[PDB]
Symmetry: D2
């Protein structure tokens, strides 16, 4: 049946709240909806072998839950401090009857990126969906406040980590495989307070489009997803200022931010074998901002 999207999920104002990054979904108010109850699989990805970075919380968690419910085995990356979020996702993947692999570690470390891919492929018996979804986002009002360490941390997480993981993954990927990279509306919106983050998110789009041309001839599709505002720990752990969290997305056409559950369908559609002429695309889901 039909459902009105406007009031399907919570609207601001939200309680004043902050966490140290990367944060925990379980400490947000309200708790985000990653599709734990609502997502019903229909056999769209049976037997696929998936690695999702940042699969413990937020958009990556929603994708991991959906992939498992569609019949795919799922390895998740995350940072060690997020173990309490990650254990929930691992249990949900397993409750869908599929294999879950927990692979915590810092993707700014090149050797860890190599081990992440090797261990995921070994555990799953192969690899044929890669989702580069982990990110650092730390807002700063001025470039004068941005140290080299700040800029480097954002670029190493969001560009180098993706590069190393993707490079390590390609020798495993058979014809028919899919790579999906999470970008952001910030690639275009380029807010004053997200100078380094926006740089990396625009970079991710060109990386996606170039790699799609490179790998298309080998039968591997490479695509990106461009979210607008979603209710995740990235925002309340310093990705946005606190007043922005309280009134998050209040001025958007629905008057509310997205919940991660709502974007999982884009990841399933892009990975599915039937979506065979989608390559090099950036698919947006921004609730009416109309960016991608």
């Amino acid at each position: 049946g039909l459902t009105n999207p406007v009031d399907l999920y919570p609207k601001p104002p939200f309680p004043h709240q902050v966490q140290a990054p990367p944060g925990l979904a379980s400490r947000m108010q309200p708790r985000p909806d990653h599709g734990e109850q609502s997502y019903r699989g229909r056999g769209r990805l049976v037997g696929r072998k998936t690695l999702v970075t940042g699969g413990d919380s937020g958009i990556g968690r929603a994708a991991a839950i959906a992939f498992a419910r569609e019949g795919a085995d799922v390895a998740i990356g995350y940072l060690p401090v997020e173990e309490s979020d990650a254990r929930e996702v691992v249990a949900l993947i397993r409750a869908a009857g599929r294999q879950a692999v927990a692979l915590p570690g810092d993707i700014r470390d090149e050797t860890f990126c190599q081990r992440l891919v090797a261990r995921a492929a070994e555990a799953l018996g192969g690899l044929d969906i890669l989702v580069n979804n982990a990110a650092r986002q730390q807002a700063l009002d001025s470039i004068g406040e941005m140290t080299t360490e700040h800029f480097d941390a954002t670029v190493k997480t969001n560009l180098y980590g993706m590069f190393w993981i993707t490079k390590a993954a390609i020798p495993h990927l058979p014809p028919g495989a899919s790579i999906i990279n999470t970008t952001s509306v910030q690639a275009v919106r380029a807010s004053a307070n997200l100078l380094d983050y926006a740089t990396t998110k625009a970079g991710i789009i060109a990386f996606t489009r170039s790699l799609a041309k490179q790998l298309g001839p080998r039968g591997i599709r490479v695509n990106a997803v461009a979210p607008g505002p979603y209710w995740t720990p990235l925002q309340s752990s310093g990705g946005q200022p606190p007043e922005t969290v309280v009134n998050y997305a209040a001025g958007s056409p629905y008057g509310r931010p997205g919940q991660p559950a709502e974007i999982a369908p884009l990841y399933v559609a892009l990975a599915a074998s039937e979506t065979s002429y989608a390559n090099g695309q950036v698919w947006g889901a921004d609730g009416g901002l109309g960016i991608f």
Copy 2:
């Protein structure tokens, strides 16, 4: 299982072939694949009520087949000369166990656009997916060859028809409904020989994004699909020069054009109730050109 997209469908060279517009799918060599055998529904749109313009052939036919197999009732628009293509789609909708409504007529006629919507809604018992997919595309190498009649025919079909149909449809659309407009990579690629067509396809994107902001607050989502090259009668009936048809998409990353079957998943995903934060988006499927 995994399937290599590169050789899943035919590659050029194709036989020298030309038709008068709008053409018939059954006269193309090879016959296009709209998903007649391959598309399997999974209950994703049960009971939805759909109107697809240009649903007799090509991308619109692939969308109509998929919608019916996902459980939706489907009305199709087309031009009277296309009856032999259209009756096949009516039969496919009925073979999926759903109601089919055949509504031929010329969408450059404002009164016909009003009757099309009124008759579709009356026959289906409502309306909650509208796909503005019909188009005119007639390549010309120079503006000196483009008469006012040429320009007006393209603009009246691709902009005015969409405007009139959409305006008439909105009073029928409940919260939870979806409007999907087919645009083109030509909105950006803007080839020398498609001056009027490219103008209209860029126009369709801004129309989509503006209307998404108007209707989002009312719970209606408005999105666009941007195909790259697909094997359809629009291309061999004057949309492309004949030598381009012979070698169509030969230089693309897969070395082949898309078949309409491959893009149907985008229409299903955009219409599904679960894709509830996709509004004002343009989703491409261009086989690695990397436009949208």
Copy 3:
């Protein structure tokens, strides 16, 4: 010397004000600055032969003044009710020592478009800069309020008029000539209240890019300019709602709208013979919105 752009021109709030379209610059509060005092020519367009539609006021007036001061002869189009604005521009072109031609008439009339070009070329002794700058902009909050007459008036002014004038002009344009089309940030921003206008402005970009590919081989360059908010009669005569006029561009990085004087340099640079590899471009001047 250096000048701070932030406070170079007036900032809101502006007096409550409205006019019947197309409006008069002389009735705005404050009066707009089209460069009447500030623009100093430097011989950049000596002997060029120009036609500017909407050259009586706003951006077109600023371009006409600059072209004349750079040594070009200038014909201007405008609507008859704007005679009092137009006579000022004609006097300023002539005070720069160049020829001015006043060509009032409605560009929605195909025969007038043909006469406009023929009379401009006859009077000037040729034609080698064409600026399609006239536009209709009438905001409406809902498609339900938008009659066919409303939509048609916007599309006929902004797309058909450009088509007819451009088609009539090309046989006059020698190698080295330039066509410049004014678009808008609305092509991308696509506000809810500018459904028809935004459609046409996106269309203008694809028209520009396609015609550039068509005419590049003949040595004719075709480019577009994408303004952000400028203080012109288009806004207070129904292009924007009244509260928007009072607080116009207050939230932008400078906190003020542009004055037409500020965008004239883009038109001069695009027309100049030295800018010989700019073809098919869209150059923005939006005061930090960062759209084009």
Copy 4:
């Protein structure tokens, strides 16, 4: 007078030619035209104080020549091996009657970036035009060939160097100053063989747009220039495969690549004080490809 842009400059085929990067303009066949004879200044930047990275050759050299001829003092960065190109630019700046400052060194070195800005500002008596134009571009057909050292060299040159130089420069820039960043059509075209380069060029655009929003309120404008193909040593020293150099831009609307002379007007126009509402823009000059 009018000049036909099509045959104003050389067209392919060009001789088979390759150099080690960064290469020398003097070894290209034919020698590039940076405007040494053609560019005539008109007092548009009198007394400005400029730093151009990569000012020894190519687009940066054309900008440096034009800036000096418009009345600005010019410091140039370059790599020590390019001294024979750089000394010619120093001589051209001095022949225009302005001060030239030669500042060779490697912008991947953060301490050098700080010294570069400090020494330029000290020598010139201030700083008010900064052009981040240096780049690394090394084509590779596959990500398997791209070592971390390759990726890091491109990212450190094109993103970190820009970040460090810009951060060091801002405390010197008074209201009225301009920052201009050279990007590329590759930000959008994203070719298969330019995976790291295209990533950085898209990043540069978002960096530009974000910084424009930060600095606009302080009266500093930040813009980008997006060249299409130009005849420069970056291309024949590994930026393109050798067979592409031989046939460079043969299929474009003019059938020839740009010469650096042709793009200098964009840098002058963006820096000029009169262009006061251009902020956060990307202005293309791609010869009819129609990208930006």
